[PDB]
Amino acid sequence: NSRYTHFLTQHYDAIPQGRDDRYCESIMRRRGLTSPCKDINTFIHGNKRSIKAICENKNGNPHRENLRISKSSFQVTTCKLHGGSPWPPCQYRATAGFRNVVVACENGLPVHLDQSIFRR
């Protein structure tokens, strides 16, 4: 359903343009995440083949209550809001990382990214 589609929109970017502040400012705006400014957001890179797999044991282990945590590690770019105001223009800071990810899967597909692990 739409929740998978909405995971992609908010947390999938196949091929990032250099993953700096300006990329964050750009892709956030583009994906509808700037009114008001989404405080923190993380984009997974690579193929979807691999992300959806976190819903099976091909690439996932159960985790906590409702979630799944990936076996593989993914390239990732966390956009973090900075400045004070919740309202555009939304200035962001990009942090590129490389680690496994945590999602909730509903009906074999990811419908939620847990952002907690990208704050610390």
What is the DSSP secondary-structure string of 67-119?
A: EEEESS-EEEEEEEE-SS-SSSS--EEEEEEEE--EEEEETTEEEEE--GGGT
CB of 105 closer than 8 Å to CB of 55: yes
d(CA 17, CA 116): 24
d(CA 117, CA 65): 15
112 is catalytic: yes
45 is catalytic: no
d(CA 74, CA 41): 15
Q: Is 68 annotated as a binding residue?
A: no
Q: Is 114 annotated as a binding residue?
A: no
Domains, the chain, in order of start with CATH, read 1-120 (3.10.130.10)
Q: Coil, helix or strand for 28?
A: helix
| Reported resolution, Å | 2.1
Q: Is 20 annotated as a binding residue?
A: yes
